[PDB]
Structure 1
């Protein structure tokens, strides 16, 4: 029974291959057939290409050797640049998405996966393109075995025995996928299941047949998530008693993700890998009062003025002049105030669900709550200790009750608490795994709900501070993303935003409840990436 799957890179995980490119170049330049493909493999196991693939020489050293081989082949058969041909061939090669999806599904099902490839040490001025491709791919596999790193090459028998040793599996337990028949032969001779890959669909049909796992025509997979233990964790002291923790991934313009109540940096798990892959340096915060960030007990530590000042200090200490700020819920509220009070530090602003509504100077925030019954829970959150006790009573119940899709409601909104007439053992929502709920449970064991609830206990202070901004407009790039089925932060609440943000851009997500990021991650990523690429680059 199979338990390991091995994939080649050129022609399997990445397309178009290379035998085809040399073939197309020959046709485009009207050269004798196979002239370039022949110069490429000249000398076989003793030739320049084998030395390149074994890591004896780098790609830049191989270029002049390949040119000499091309000259010899043209001489025998009786503006051209090998550098330009190979630069263009490497650049055009893209990840074979359905092949990657099949490898992802096999790993999800318990398979050990590996990439086994004949590759080179790339020292060209344009090597970063290849570095980026390898980085994106390798993160999805258990092992990456490169010929130039092991000093062995397919079809040599040693690399297969080395592959087996690495997998800690007998040959009958391994499926081996390759586009080159000669490279497939030794794995077959060892007893491995082999697949000659010509077109992806047929290769995947063969793969599905031998594994007994559906891989072709399967549903749209969720975006890549985050394994907390595999992330880079950052810590900045913003003042003597306050440190902020963040997870960091990627390079490019800084993008600061600000979660809501009662969440975590982990609420952005489906966005962090996507945004980093899109070319941004993501900084996903644990907001003040949460997870590994400090949680001072004082109510005044959580007013918007102090939270914004600390986020400015956070940028100062990291040496960042600006970041794009993207917030959800209370984090969305914080991002609009960052745009209003610190525009010079905000490259662009985006909010999920949270609208920008200016303070009414003729109405107390309490009177404004009066007008709307959907915000009654905010009054319940006022008295220190009351909501903490109910929310801390059973963490698994708190999170399982909260984190549900629009059609999974288990909570109602006197004589109460959030959990009146709510199950003691709620069923697990289709949005989350038990493992994910337990991550939030574990995060909230450190400081509980006091800091998070204090974000609601500064209504009067926040209102007074917000009134100082009444004559201003948000004129930096801005995005408002509404969620059709958020029954508290309704899309309708954002209807007048253009009055204060005239150049505002929008996104809208149908069939999406309050927990936007985990409810509809693919759509959130699509919306944010499109907006970042047009407005924040």
Structure 2
């Protein structure tokens, strides 16, 4: 059965890529746009964007390996390894023309390498609410004068001994609610049913582990990206970031400027980290307009 409700006119389906059965939800007609979710979530965070975007594009939203209904990666969880699966998946549906990429949160981590290495395959790029893993992440503070910092979980999740799985097991719903809301400006959008759905999904033991394995591979991703970044991105790029509590603000664009030649950026006041849910209407509009140019 489906973990999340599929919007009318879309199909939930699977493709094997490099021996890994990936789940995705797909609909629309026209050139391909792939939407990639991040931590704590699945394809479903894009469910409000999808029907609108489907009016002009074929839309595909995969579950990251090990998350949602996708199988764990057989290679590893570093960005360069995971990006392979997402690239090949996109190419099954757009073998003959470039496709657009939209990524949120660790979806960025898991797509940047395939973008920079296959630039001819990427027409336009939208990145929102996560740093590309580089040495900038080592400057983020453990603790702040206002208390709990925004990224202390980097260390919690990266820790060995399965620290995170062990503490969070049986308390997935409680932990996820805290994590989402502490990174949100608009908390009201996360209803009990929505949180139930997400918690149920990432609580599958292989998915709870998959979640943290992305973070255990984070330093490897940074090292990979140090080499990859020698080539700047040449395709038109737009960044989005929340300007409210939990958001990344000016960091998103300012980082991307070091990576891309052709970038525009927006900061959305009153919005936190979870842009597609906290601020669906302006986020959708900005993405649709940027891609429809």
Do they superpose with TM above 0.5?
yes
Task: Report the Cα distance in structure 1 between the residues aligned to 2:266 and 2:238, rounded to whole angstroms.
Answer: 7
Cα distance change on mapping 1:407 and 1:283 into 2, 3 Å: closer
1:164-243 correspondence runs (5 A): 227-228=5-6, 230=8, 231-240=10-19, 242-243=20-21
* Matched residue, 1:244: 22
> Aligned pair 1:507/2:286, yes or no?
no
Cα distance, 1:370 vs structure 2: 6.0
Please list every run of 5 or more consecutive structure 2 residues that lacks an aligned counterpart in the other structure: 143-148
Task: State the Cα deviation string for residues 273-315 of structure 1 (Å, max 9, x = none).
Answer: 11113x111101111111110025x7x6101111111112213
Cα distance change on mapping 1:371 and 1:324 into 2, 3 Å: closer
Task: Report the Cα distance in structure 2 between the residues aligned to 1:229 and 1:496, rounded to whole angstroms.
Answer: 34
1:498-537 correspondence runs (5 A): 498-534=257-293
Please list every run of 5 or more consecutive structure 1 residues that lacks an aligned counterpart in the other structure: 1-225, 409-428
Alignment partner for residue 305 of structure 1, among 76, 80, 91? 80
Task: Report the Cα distance in structure 2 between the residues aligned to 1:431 and 1:371, rounded to whole angstroms.
Answer: 27
Cα distance change on mapping 1:391 and 1:275 into 2, 3 Å: farther
Task: Report the Cα distance in structure 2 between the residues aligned to 1:489 and 1:439, rounded to whole angstroms.
Answer: 26
For the aligned residue pairs, the C-alpha RMSD in angstroms reads: 2.5
* Matched residue, 2:195: 437
Rg larger in 1 or in 2? 1
How many equivalent pairs are there? Answer: 278
Cα distance, 1:407 vs structure 2: 4.8
Task: Report the Cα distance in structure 1 between the residues aligned to 2:185 and 2:256, rounded to whole angstroms.
Answer: 28
- TM-score between the two structures when normalised by the length of structure 2: 0.85
* Matched residue, 1:271: 49
Task: Report the Cα distance in structure 2 between the residues aligned to 1:229 and 1:508, rounded to whole angstroms.
Answer: 28
Q: Is the contact made by 1:238 and 1:313 (CA closer than 8 Å) also made in structure 2?
A: yes
Task: Report the Cα distance in structure 1 between the residues aligned to 2:61 and 2:264, rounded to whole angstroms.
Answer: 23
Instruction: Provide the secondary structure at the position in 2 that maps to 1:495.
Output: helix
Which of the two has greater strand per residue?
2
Cα distance change on mapping 1:527 and 1:266 into 2, 3 Å: same
Task: Report the Cα distance in structure 1 between the residues aligned to 2:36 and 2:284, rounded to whole angstroms.
Answer: 15
> Aligned pair 1:400/2:177, yes or no?
yes
Instruction: Provide the secondary structure at the position in 2 that maps to 1:325.
Output: strand
* Matched residue, 2:38: 260
